[PDB]
Amino acid sequence: AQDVTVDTLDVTTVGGAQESVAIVDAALKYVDSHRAELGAFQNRFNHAINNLDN
Amino acid sequence: NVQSRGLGVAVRNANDGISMAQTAEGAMKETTNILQRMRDLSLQSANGSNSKAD
């Protein structure tokens, strides 16, 4: 098992490219997951404004 | 006179009872709005189109 990340993502041979596409998918999934978490946070407080206004 | 002052604090009191009812009713609007959002969103996830990540 070797730990690789986007910073260590290197594509100079064809094999490296096949690693990169998988690595980017993991990074994109993580980014999207936290985007949803921030979106849920946004969708919590917008109900808090009009609640506290009531 | 005793009765007249009695209704003086009685109209104040019944207004207070109204105020606490509508303060609760104000937050009542938000909780039902939250419930509507959960139900509509759970209906969205009920499909097989979205994968486990969604």
UniProtKB/Swiss-Prot annotation, chain A:
What does the UniProt entry say about where the protein is found? Secreted; Bacterial flagellum
Q: Which residues form a coiled coil?
A: 31-54
Tell me what else is known: V.cholerae is able to differentially regulate the flagellins within the flagellum maybe to produce flagella which are particularly suited for motility within a given environment.
Family statement: Belongs to the bacterial flagellin family.
Instruction: State whether it acts alone or in a complex, and with which partners, per the record.
Output: Heteromer of multiple flagellin subunits including FlaA, FlaB, FlaC, FlaD and FlaE.
Entry function: Flagellin is the subunit protein which polymerizes to form the filaments of bacterial flagella. FlaC is not essential for flagellar synthesis and motility.
| Stated name of the protein | Flagellin C
Q: Per the UniProt entry, what species is this protein from, by scientific name?
A: Vibrio cholerae serotype O1 (strain ATCC 39315 / El Tor Inaba N16961)
What taxonomic classification does the UniProt entry list for its organism? Bacteria, Pseudomonadati, Pseudomonadota, Gammaproteobacteria, Vibrionales
UniProtKB/Swiss-Prot annotation, chain B:
Q: Which residues of the full protein are shown?
A: 55 to 108 of 377
**What organism is recorded for this protein?**
Vibrio cholerae serotype O1 (strain ATCC 39315 / El Tor Inaba N16961)
Subunit organization: Heteromer of multiple flagellin subunits including FlaA, FlaB, FlaC, FlaD and FlaE.
Family per similarity comment: Belongs to the bacterial flagellin family.
Q: Where is this protein found?
A: Secreted; Bacterial flagellum
Cited function: Flagellin is the subunit protein which polymerizes to form the filaments of bacterial flagella. FlaC is not essential for flagellar synthesis and motility.
Q: What name has this protein been given in UniProt?
A: Flagellin C
Q: List the disulfide bonds.
A: none
Q: What else is known?
A: V.cholerae is able to differentially regulate the flagellins within the flagellum maybe to produce flagella which are particularly suited for motility within a given environment.
